[PDB]
PDB file of C-alpha atoms and ligand atoms in Angstrom:
ATOM      1  CA  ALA U  23       5.482  20.153 -13.269  1.00 37.66           C
ATOM      2  CA  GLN U  24       6.933  19.500 -16.729  1.00 38.06           C
ATOM      3  CA  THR U  25       9.001  16.577 -18.098  1.00 39.47           C
ATOM      4  CA  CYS U  26       9.883  16.930 -21.799  1.00 38.01           C
ATOM      5  CA  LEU U  27      10.890  13.823 -23.779  1.00 38.31           C
ATOM      6  CA  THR U  28      12.479  13.624 -27.249  1.00 39.09           C
ATOM      7  CA  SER U  29      12.958   9.856 -27.741  1.00 39.24           C
ATOM      8  CA  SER U  30      10.346   7.066 -27.716  1.00 41.06           C
ATOM      9  CA  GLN U  31       9.266   6.141 -24.174  1.00 35.16           C
ATOM     10  CA  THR U  32       6.346   4.819 -22.139  1.00 35.54           C
ATOM     11  CA  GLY U  33       5.574   5.081 -18.425  1.00 34.78           C
ATOM     12  CA  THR U  34       3.344   6.784 -15.887  1.00 33.28           C
ATOM     13  CA  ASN U  35       3.083  10.464 -15.118  1.00 30.41           C
ATOM     14  CA  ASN U  36       0.808  12.104 -12.536  1.00 29.84           C
ATOM     15  CA  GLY U  37      -1.447   9.032 -12.333  1.00 29.90           C
ATOM     16  CA  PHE U  38      -1.752   8.561 -16.116  1.00 30.35           C
ATOM     17  CA  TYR U  39      -0.041   6.147 -18.426  1.00 28.56           C
ATOM     18  CA  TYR U  40       1.707   7.684 -21.455  1.00 27.27           C
ATOM     19  CA  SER U  41       3.117   6.333 -24.713  1.00 26.97           C
ATOM     20  CA  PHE U  42       5.305   8.438 -26.994  1.00 26.16           C
ATOM     21  CA  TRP U  43       6.822   7.072 -30.217  1.00 26.91           C
ATOM     22  CA  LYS U  44       8.595   8.534 -33.265  1.00 27.31           C
ATOM     23  CA  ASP U  45      10.756   7.054 -35.990  1.00 27.53           C
ATOM     24  CA  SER U  46      14.192   8.735 -36.514  1.00 26.80           C
ATOM     25  CA  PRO U  47      13.705  11.921 -38.660  1.00 28.58           C
ATOM     26  CA  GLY U  48      12.998  15.343 -37.151  1.00 29.23           C
ATOM     27  CA  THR U  49      12.128  16.405 -33.629  1.00 27.70           C
ATOM     28  CA  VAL U  50       9.273  15.867 -31.197  1.00 25.85           C
ATOM     29  CA  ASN U  51       9.200  17.591 -27.820  1.00 24.88           C
ATOM     30  CA  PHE U  52       6.638  15.523 -25.929  1.00 22.60           C
ATOM     31  CA  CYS U  53       6.106  17.360 -22.624  1.00 25.18           C
ATOM     32  CA  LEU U  54       4.348  15.662 -19.698  1.00 25.23           C
ATOM     33  CA  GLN U  55       2.328  18.120 -17.564  1.00 24.28           C
ATOM     34  CA  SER U  56       0.266  17.964 -14.335  1.00 21.96           C
ATOM     35  CA  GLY U  57      -2.754  15.605 -14.077  1.00 21.79           C
ATOM     36  CA  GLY U  58      -3.969  14.175 -17.406  1.00 21.01           C
ATOM     37  CA  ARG U  59      -2.248  16.829 -19.492  1.00 21.47           C
ATOM     38  CA  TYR U  60       0.511  16.615 -22.101  1.00 25.31           C
ATOM     39  CA  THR U  61       1.794  18.936 -24.805  1.00 24.02           C
ATOM     40  CA  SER U  62       3.535  18.168 -28.050  1.00 23.16           C
ATOM     41  CA  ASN U  63       5.369  19.949 -30.790  1.00 19.66           C
ATOM     42  CA  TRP U  64       6.778  18.278 -33.838  1.00 22.07           C
ATOM     43  CA  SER U  65       8.962  19.425 -36.728  1.00 22.86           C
ATOM     44  CA  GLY U  66      10.440  17.656 -39.801  1.00 24.57           C
ATOM     45  CA  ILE U  67       9.233  14.268 -38.545  1.00 23.73           C
ATOM     46  CA  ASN U  68       8.305  11.244 -40.606  1.00 20.73           C
ATOM     47  CA  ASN U  69       5.813   9.592 -38.220  1.00 21.00           C
ATOM     48  CA  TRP U  70       5.095  10.009 -34.507  1.00 17.64           C
ATOM     49  CA  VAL U  71       2.194   9.295 -32.119  1.00 14.62           C
ATOM     50  CA  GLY U  72       1.814   9.856 -28.405  1.00 13.06           C
ATOM     51  CA  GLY U  73      -0.390  10.863 -25.512  1.00 12.79           C
ATOM     52  CA  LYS U  74      -1.810  10.127 -22.080  1.00  9.82           C
ATOM     53  CA  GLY U  75      -4.285   7.499 -20.985  1.00  9.30           C
ATOM     54  CA  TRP U  76      -4.253   3.946 -19.642  1.00  6.42           C
ATOM     55  CA  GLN U  77      -1.783   1.054 -19.746  1.00  4.89           C
ATOM     56  CA  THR U  78      -4.707  -1.317 -20.381  1.00  2.05           C
ATOM     57  CA  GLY U  79      -7.557  -0.214 -22.579  1.00  2.00           C
ATOM     58  CA  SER U  80     -11.208  -0.883 -21.705  1.00  2.00           C
ATOM     59  CA  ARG U  81     -14.794   0.184 -22.514  1.00  2.00           C
ATOM     60  CA  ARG U  82     -14.203   3.277 -20.311  1.00  2.00           C
ATOM     61  CA  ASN U  83     -15.667   6.625 -21.430  1.00  2.00           C
ATOM     62  CA  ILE U  84     -12.860   9.001 -22.124  1.00  2.00           C
ATOM     63  CA  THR U  85     -13.077  12.800 -22.080  1.00  2.00           C
ATOM     64  CA  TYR U  86     -10.462  15.170 -23.461  1.00  2.00           C
ATOM     65  CA  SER U  87      -9.983  18.887 -24.098  1.00  2.00           C
ATOM     66  CA  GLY U  88      -7.375  21.296 -25.367  1.00  2.00           C
ATOM     67  CA  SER U  89      -5.898  22.533 -28.616  1.00  2.00           C
ATOM     68  CA  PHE U  90      -4.594  20.951 -31.779  1.00  2.00           C
ATOM     69  CA  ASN U  91      -2.562  22.903 -34.316  1.00  3.97           C
ATOM     70  CA  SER U  92      -1.850  20.915 -37.482  1.00  6.35           C
ATOM     71  CA  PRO U  93      -1.527  22.838 -40.810  1.00  8.45           C
ATOM     72  CA  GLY U  94      -0.131  19.670 -42.402  1.00  8.19           C
ATOM     73  CA  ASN U  95      -0.918  15.991 -41.822  1.00 11.06           C
ATOM     74  CA  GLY U  96      -1.773  15.274 -38.164  1.00 10.73           C
ATOM     75  CA  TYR U  97      -4.525  13.492 -36.208  1.00  9.64           C
ATOM     76  CA  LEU U  98      -6.213  13.979 -32.852  1.00  9.17           C
ATOM     77  CA  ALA U  99      -7.644  10.585 -31.862  1.00  7.00           C
ATOM     78  CA  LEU U 100      -8.375   8.085 -29.185  1.00  8.40           C
ATOM     79  CA  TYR U 101      -5.670   5.567 -30.039  1.00  8.45           C
ATOM     80  CA  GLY U 102      -4.779   2.070 -28.862  1.00  5.47           C
ATOM     81  CA  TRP U 103      -3.696  -1.477 -29.538  1.00  5.08           C
ATOM     82  CA  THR U 104      -4.789  -5.026 -28.963  1.00  3.01           C
ATOM     83  CA  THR U 105      -2.834  -8.276 -29.290  1.00  3.47           C
ATOM     84  CA  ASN U 106      -4.314 -11.617 -30.537  1.00  2.96           C
ATOM     85  CA  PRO U 107      -5.129 -10.257 -32.996  1.00  2.00           C
ATOM     86  CA  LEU U 108      -2.651  -7.360 -33.243  1.00  4.63           C
ATOM     87  CA  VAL U 109      -4.848  -4.354 -33.966  1.00  5.29           C
ATOM     88  CA  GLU U 110      -4.079  -0.625 -34.034  1.00  2.71           C
ATOM     89  CA  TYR U 111      -7.286   1.392 -33.565  1.00  2.00           C
ATOM     90  CA  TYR U 112      -8.383   5.057 -33.866  1.00  2.00           C
ATOM     91  CA  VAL U 113     -11.376   7.197 -32.987  1.00  2.00           C
ATOM     92  CA  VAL U 114     -10.377  10.351 -34.949  1.00  2.00           C
ATOM     93  CA  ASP U 115     -12.085  13.576 -33.812  1.00  2.00           C
ATOM     94  CA  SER U 116      -9.903  16.016 -35.734  1.00  2.00           C
ATOM     95  CA  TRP U 117      -7.164  16.099 -38.350  1.00  2.00           C
ATOM     96  CA  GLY U 118      -5.026  18.594 -40.256  1.00  2.00           C
ATOM     97  CA  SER U 119      -4.685  18.781 -44.002  1.00  2.00           C
ATOM     98  CA  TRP U 120      -5.630  15.187 -44.819  1.00  2.00           C
ATOM     99  CA  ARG U 121      -8.696  13.209 -43.656  1.00  2.00           C
ATOM    100  CA  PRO U 122      -7.545   9.659 -42.713  1.00  2.00           C
ATOM    101  CA  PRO U 123      -7.313   6.778 -43.578  1.00  2.00           C
ATOM    102  CA  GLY U 124      -7.309   7.570 -47.351  1.00  2.00           C
ATOM    103  CA  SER U 125      -7.755   4.953 -50.109  1.00  2.00           C
ATOM    104  CA  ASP U 126      -6.070   2.215 -48.076  1.00  2.00           C
ATOM    105  CA  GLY U 127      -9.204   2.359 -45.878  1.00  2.00           C
ATOM    106  CA  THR U 128     -12.143   0.140 -46.771  1.00  2.00           C
ATOM    107  CA  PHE U 129     -15.396   1.892 -45.818  1.00  2.00           C
ATOM    108  CA  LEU U 130     -17.647  -0.421 -43.728  1.00  2.00           C
ATOM    109  CA  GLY U 131     -20.440   1.798 -42.388  1.00  2.00           C
ATOM    110  CA  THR U 132     -21.094   4.574 -39.870  1.00  2.00           C
ATOM    111  CA  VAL U 133     -21.647   4.890 -36.101  1.00  2.00           C
ATOM    112  CA  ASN U 134     -23.373   7.703 -34.195  1.00  2.00           C
ATOM    113  CA  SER U 135     -21.662   8.469 -30.866  1.00  2.00           C
ATOM    114  CA  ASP U 136     -21.227  11.547 -28.619  1.00  2.00           C
ATOM    115  CA  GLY U 137     -23.168  13.855 -30.918  1.00  2.00           C
ATOM    116  CA  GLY U 138     -21.072  12.947 -33.954  1.00  2.00           C
ATOM    117  CA  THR U 139     -21.306  10.598 -36.918  1.00  3.89           C
ATOM    118  CA  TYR U 140     -18.154   8.571 -37.655  1.00  4.40           C
ATOM    119  CA  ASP U 141     -17.162   6.702 -40.815  1.00  7.40           C
ATOM    120  CA  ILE U 142     -15.830   3.170 -40.089  1.00  6.26           C
ATOM    121  CA  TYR U 143     -12.809   1.783 -42.017  1.00  7.38           C
ATOM    122  CA  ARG U 144     -10.468  -1.186 -42.027  1.00  7.04           C
ATOM    123  CA  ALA U 145      -6.928  -0.583 -43.381  1.00  8.72           C
ATOM    124  CA  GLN U 146      -3.915  -2.902 -43.489  1.00  7.47           C
ATOM    125  CA  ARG U 147      -0.398  -1.966 -42.422  1.00  7.59           C
ATOM    126  CA  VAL U 148       2.289  -4.042 -44.194  1.00  6.01           C
ATOM    127  CA  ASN U 149       5.624  -4.681 -42.470  1.00  5.55           C
ATOM    128  CA  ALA U 150       4.990  -1.590 -40.333  1.00  7.97           C
ATOM    129  CA  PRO U 151       6.192  -0.547 -36.843  1.00  5.21           C
ATOM    130  CA  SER U 152       3.986  -1.874 -34.016  1.00  5.83           C
ATOM    131  CA  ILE U 153       3.926  -2.527 -30.260  1.00  4.50           C
ATOM    132  CA  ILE U 154       5.392  -6.001 -31.074  1.00  6.13           C
ATOM    133  CA  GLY U 155       7.949  -4.847 -33.705  1.00  8.55           C
ATOM    134  CA  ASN U 156       7.614  -4.810 -37.479  1.00  8.38           C
ATOM    135  CA  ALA U 157       4.396  -6.597 -38.399  1.00  9.56           C
ATOM    136  CA  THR U 158       1.507  -6.883 -40.839  1.00 10.47           C
ATOM    137  CA  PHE U 159      -1.823  -6.076 -39.208  1.00  6.87           C
ATOM    138  CA  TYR U 160      -5.235  -4.404 -39.529  1.00  6.29           C
ATOM    139  CA  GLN U 161      -6.223  -0.972 -38.253  1.00  6.18           C
ATOM    140  CA  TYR U 162      -9.822  -0.220 -37.218  1.00  6.15           C
ATOM    141  CA  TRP U 163     -10.835   3.433 -37.699  1.00  7.18           C
ATOM    142  CA  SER U 164     -13.776   5.585 -36.705  1.00  3.72           C
ATOM    143  CA  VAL U 165     -13.331   9.005 -38.338  1.00  4.94           C
ATOM    144  CA  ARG U 166     -15.665  11.879 -37.431  1.00  4.39           C
ATOM    145  CA  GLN U 167     -17.459  13.206 -40.529  1.00  7.29           C
ATOM    146  CA  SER U 168     -16.567  16.751 -39.424  1.00  9.97           C
ATOM    147  CA  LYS U 169     -13.808  17.960 -37.064  1.00  8.64           C
ATOM    148  CA  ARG U 170     -14.272  18.409 -33.313  1.00  9.22           C
ATOM    149  CA  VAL U 171     -11.636  19.373 -30.711  1.00  9.11           C
ATOM    150  CA  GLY U 172     -12.876  18.301 -27.281  1.00  6.65           C
ATOM    151  CA  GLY U 173     -15.554  16.143 -25.751  1.00 11.62           C
ATOM    152  CA  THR U 174     -16.287  12.603 -24.683  1.00  9.26           C
ATOM    153  CA  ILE U 175     -15.589   9.411 -26.586  1.00  5.54           C
ATOM    154  CA  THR U 176     -17.938   6.542 -25.574  1.00  7.88           C
ATOM    155  CA  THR U 177     -15.481   3.802 -26.552  1.00  9.14           C
ATOM    156  CA  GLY U 178     -18.124   1.058 -26.176  1.00  4.63           C
ATOM    157  CA  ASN U 179     -20.108   2.546 -29.090  1.00  2.53           C
ATOM    158  CA  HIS U 180     -17.128   2.345 -31.424  1.00  5.35           C
ATOM    159  CA  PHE U 181     -16.012  -1.143 -30.282  1.00  6.33           C
ATOM    160  CA  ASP U 182     -19.566  -2.475 -30.768  1.00  2.84           C
ATOM    161  CA  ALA U 183     -19.942  -0.850 -34.214  1.00  3.48           C
ATOM    162  CA  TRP U 184     -16.587  -2.295 -35.372  1.00  5.12           C
ATOM    163  CA  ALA U 185     -17.595  -5.753 -34.066  1.00  5.02           C
ATOM    164  CA  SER U 186     -20.882  -5.464 -36.043  1.00  2.00           C
ATOM    165  CA  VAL U 187     -18.874  -5.152 -39.293  1.00  2.47           C
ATOM    166  CA  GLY U 188     -16.522  -8.052 -38.457  1.00  2.00           C
ATOM    167  CA  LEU U 189     -13.676  -6.125 -36.797  1.00  2.00           C
ATOM    168  CA  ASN U 190     -12.701  -8.253 -33.760  1.00  2.00           C
ATOM    169  CA  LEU U 191     -10.620  -6.632 -30.991  1.00  2.00           C
ATOM    170  CA  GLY U 192      -7.962  -8.747 -29.221  1.00  2.00           C
ATOM    171  CA  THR U 193      -6.567  -8.490 -25.659  1.00  2.00           C
ATOM    172  CA  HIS U 194      -6.321  -4.775 -24.785  1.00  2.00           C
ATOM    173  CA  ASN U 195      -2.922  -3.131 -24.657  1.00  2.00           C
ATOM    174  CA  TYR U 196      -2.593   0.684 -24.117  1.00  2.00           C
ATOM    175  CA  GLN U 197      -5.325   3.263 -24.820  1.00  2.00           C
ATOM    176  CA  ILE U 198      -4.451   6.974 -25.030  1.00  2.00           C
ATOM    177  CA  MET U 199      -5.809  10.315 -26.265  1.00  2.00           C
ATOM    178  CA  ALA U 200      -3.185  10.724 -28.974  1.00  4.59           C
ATOM    179  CA  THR U 201      -1.689  13.303 -31.269  1.00  5.91           C
ATOM    180  CA  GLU U 202      -0.217  11.824 -34.469  1.00  9.07           C
ATOM    181  CA  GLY U 203       1.909  13.553 -37.108  1.00  9.87           C
ATOM    182  CA  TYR U 204       2.917  12.436 -40.604  1.00  7.02           C
ATOM    183  CA  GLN U 205       5.645  14.241 -42.604  1.00  7.61           C
ATOM    184  CA  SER U 206       4.563  17.504 -41.008  1.00 10.30           C
ATOM    185  CA  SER U 207       5.026  20.071 -38.236  1.00  7.05           C
ATOM    186  CA  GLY U 208       2.614  21.146 -35.529  1.00  5.14           C
ATOM    187  CA  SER U 209       1.626  21.221 -31.875  1.00  6.13           C
ATOM    188  CA  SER U 210      -1.049  20.107 -29.427  1.00  8.26           C
ATOM    189  CA  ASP U 211      -2.013  20.567 -25.775  1.00  7.14           C
ATOM    190  CA  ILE U 212      -4.360  17.877 -24.538  1.00  8.81           C
ATOM    191  CA  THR U 213      -5.861  16.900 -21.166  1.00  8.17           C
ATOM    192  CA  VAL U 214      -7.489  13.481 -20.641  1.00  9.88           C
ATOM    193  CA  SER U 215      -9.881  12.079 -18.007  1.00  9.21           C
ATOM    194  CA  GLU U 216     -12.195   8.975 -17.576  1.00  6.34           C
ATOM    195  CA  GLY U 217     -15.728   8.301 -16.218  1.00  6.68           C
TER     196      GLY U 217
HETATM  197  C1  LIG O   1       9.127  -0.831 -44.298  1.00  5.62           C
HETATM  198  O1  LIG O   1       8.544  -0.491 -43.032  1.00  5.62           O
HETATM  199  C2  LIG O   1       7.633   0.542 -42.913  1.00  5.62           C
HETATM  200  C3  LIG O   1       6.395   0.454 -43.563  1.00  5.62           C
HETATM  201  C4  LIG O   1       5.476   1.498 -43.447  1.00  5.62           C
HETATM  202  C5  LIG O   1       4.158   1.448 -44.116  1.00  5.62           C
HETATM  203  C6  LIG O   1       3.474   0.324 -44.346  1.00  5.62           C
HETATM  204  C7  LIG O   1       2.148   0.413 -45.006  1.00  5.62           C
HETATM  205  O2  LIG O   1       1.410  -0.560 -45.058  1.00  5.62           O
HETATM  206  O3  LIG O   1       1.672   1.674 -45.583  1.00  5.62           O
HETATM  207  C8  LIG O   1       2.454   2.419 -46.527  1.00  5.62           C
HETATM  208  C9  LIG O   1       1.756   3.714 -46.925  1.00  5.62           C
HETATM  209  O4  LIG O   1       1.518   4.504 -45.756  1.00  5.62           O
HETATM  210  C10 LIG O   1       0.180   5.005 -45.751  1.00  5.62           C
HETATM  211  O5  LIG O   1       0.390   6.322 -45.896  1.00  5.62           O
HETATM  212  C11 LIG O   1      -0.265   7.555 -45.655  1.00  5.62           C
HETATM  213  C12 LIG O   1       0.174   8.646 -46.633  1.00  5.62           C
HETATM  214  O6  LIG O   1      -0.135   8.284 -47.964  1.00  5.62           O
HETATM  215  C13 LIG O   1      -0.522   9.939 -46.293  1.00  5.62           C
HETATM  216  O7  LIG O   1       0.056  10.930 -47.173  1.00  5.62           O
HETATM  217  C14 LIG O   1      -0.835  11.984 -47.456  1.00  5.62           C
HETATM  218  C15 LIG O   1      -1.335  11.774 -48.891  1.00  5.62           C
HETATM  219  O8  LIG O   1      -1.934  12.943 -49.423  1.00  5.62           O
HETATM  220  C16 LIG O   1      -1.149  14.056 -49.376  1.00  5.62           C
HETATM  221  O9  LIG O   1      -1.816  15.089 -50.067  1.00  5.62           O
HETATM  222  C17 LIG O   1      -0.884  14.449 -47.939  1.00  5.62           C
HETATM  223  O10 LIG O   1      -0.140  15.648 -47.841  1.00  5.62           O
HETATM  224  C18 LIG O   1      -0.085  13.315 -47.299  1.00  5.62           C
HETATM  225  O11 LIG O   1       0.225  13.623 -45.948  1.00  5.62           O
HETATM  226  O12 LIG O   1      -0.403  10.270 -44.970  1.00  5.62           O
HETATM  227  C19 LIG O   1      -0.800   9.323 -43.994  1.00  5.62           C
HETATM  228  C20 LIG O   1      -0.043   8.018 -44.214  1.00  5.62           C
HETATM  229  O13 LIG O   1      -0.582   6.992 -43.423  1.00  5.62           O
HETATM  230  C21 LIG O   1      -0.189   6.991 -42.038  1.00  5.62           C
HETATM  231  O14 LIG O   1       0.984   6.297 -41.845  1.00  5.62           O
HETATM  232  C22 LIG O   1       1.378   6.147 -40.494  1.00  5.62           C
HETATM  233  C23 LIG O   1       0.332   5.369 -39.680  1.00  5.62           C
HETATM  234  O15 LIG O   1       0.719   5.343 -38.302  1.00  5.62           O
HETATM  235  C24 LIG O   1      -1.060   5.992 -39.864  1.00  5.62           C
HETATM  236  O16 LIG O   1      -2.052   5.118 -39.363  1.00  5.62           O
HETATM  237  C25 LIG O   1      -1.357   6.296 -41.348  1.00  5.62           C
HETATM  238  O17 LIG O   1      -2.583   7.006 -41.488  1.00  5.62           O
HETATM  239  C26 LIG O   1      -0.614   4.083 -46.661  1.00  5.62           C
HETATM  240  O18 LIG O   1      -1.620   4.832 -47.349  1.00  5.62           O
HETATM  241  C27 LIG O   1       0.412   3.471 -47.603  1.00  5.62           C
HETATM  242  O19 LIG O   1       0.407   4.113 -48.882  1.00  5.62           O
HETATM  243  C28 LIG O   1       5.778   2.628 -42.685  1.00  5.62           C
HETATM  244  C29 LIG O   1       7.008   2.722 -42.035  1.00  5.62           C
HETATM  245  C30 LIG O   1       7.934   1.680 -42.146  1.00  5.62           C
HETATM  246  O20 LIG O   1       9.131   1.794 -41.496  1.00  5.62           O
HETATM  247  O1  LIG O   2      10.356  -0.391 -28.114  1.00  9.26           O
HETATM  248  C1  LIG O   2       9.072  -0.759 -28.596  1.00  9.26           C
HETATM  249  C2  LIG O   2       8.368   0.405 -29.318  1.00  9.26           C
HETATM  250  O2  LIG O   2       9.104   0.820 -30.455  1.00  9.26           O
HETATM  251  C3  LIG O   2       6.941   0.075 -29.719  1.00  9.26           C
HETATM  252  O3  LIG O   2       6.385   1.343 -30.137  1.00  9.26           O
HETATM  253  C4  LIG O   2       5.253   1.291 -30.968  1.00  9.26           C
HETATM  254  C5  LIG O   2       5.721   1.383 -32.426  1.00  9.26           C
HETATM  255  O4  LIG O   2       4.592   1.550 -33.277  1.00  9.26           O
HETATM  256  C6  LIG O   2       3.922   2.716 -33.057  1.00  9.26           C
HETATM  257  O5  LIG O   2       2.924   2.855 -34.044  1.00  9.26           O
HETATM  258  C7  LIG O   2       3.265   2.682 -31.699  1.00  9.26           C
HETATM  259  O6  LIG O   2       2.526   3.873 -31.476  1.00  9.26           O
HETATM  260  C8  LIG O   2       4.320   2.462 -30.609  1.00  9.26           C
HETATM  261  O7  LIG O   2       3.685   2.162 -29.388  1.00  9.26           O
HETATM  262  O8  LIG O   2       6.239  -0.493 -28.680  1.00  9.26           O
HETATM  263  C9  LIG O   2       6.822  -1.606 -28.004  1.00  9.26           C
HETATM  264  C10 LIG O   2       8.194  -1.235 -27.440  1.00  9.26           C
HETATM  265  O9  LIG O   2       8.786  -2.336 -26.781  1.00  9.26           O
HETATM  266 NA1   NA O   3     -17.045   9.257 -30.075  1.00  9.63          NA
END
């Protein structure tokens, strides 16, 4: 059954944790579906990110499938946080008009995982929204060298590769298969599972 949300919220739905966040402009209809599924549509937003997964991240292997429709700036990524240090992390499989993280990403190397090759970056967010309120913190990124929509993400491969280039993860907070939009409009329909 469906539960559509329009304001930032976290919780559990059909055995899966979810996180949904947007800043004030525009509209996101973040619709919780059966099992590990959610849909999104966004319009006129500034920034939003949300999806289904786990309240506490781990080295679990995560599989996802579905559709991602982003003519402007959007991302389809495994997405999560740690505390101590505060870290926002991404394993980006697809994107819209703009390949992240841009020039604010420092290239650190590559990792091969799940049939793909990913570029590794560190970026810094300055006085930016976070799971602990406005903060200044690093992001760790793996970004697939070409787009893919669907498959398995062997998280351990990414975590180990980041560690090998000095990117230390803290205590795991949430870990979700996320859709992100930036100053754009679009939609997605994504189903997650582990193991
Ligand atoms: C005051 O509080 C605050 C602070 C921030 C931001 C803090 C910060 O450190 O970064 C500021 C800038 O945001 C990033 O921006 C990206 C933006 O440049 C990019 O635009 C592309 C550029 O090319 C064009 O051709 C594209 O059409 C256009 O879309 O889009 C992505 C932006 O970055 C995203 O921002 C949101 C994060 O969640 C994502 O991780 C990140 O990828 C940096 O490059 C800085 O220039 C924000 C909000 C508040 O309130
Ligand atoms: O109310 C708080 C939320 O606003 C906060 O949400 C985070 C804000 O930064 C976004 O980049 C994240 O995706 C989102 O989780 O989390 C903590 C909560 O208490
Ligand atoms: Na992967």
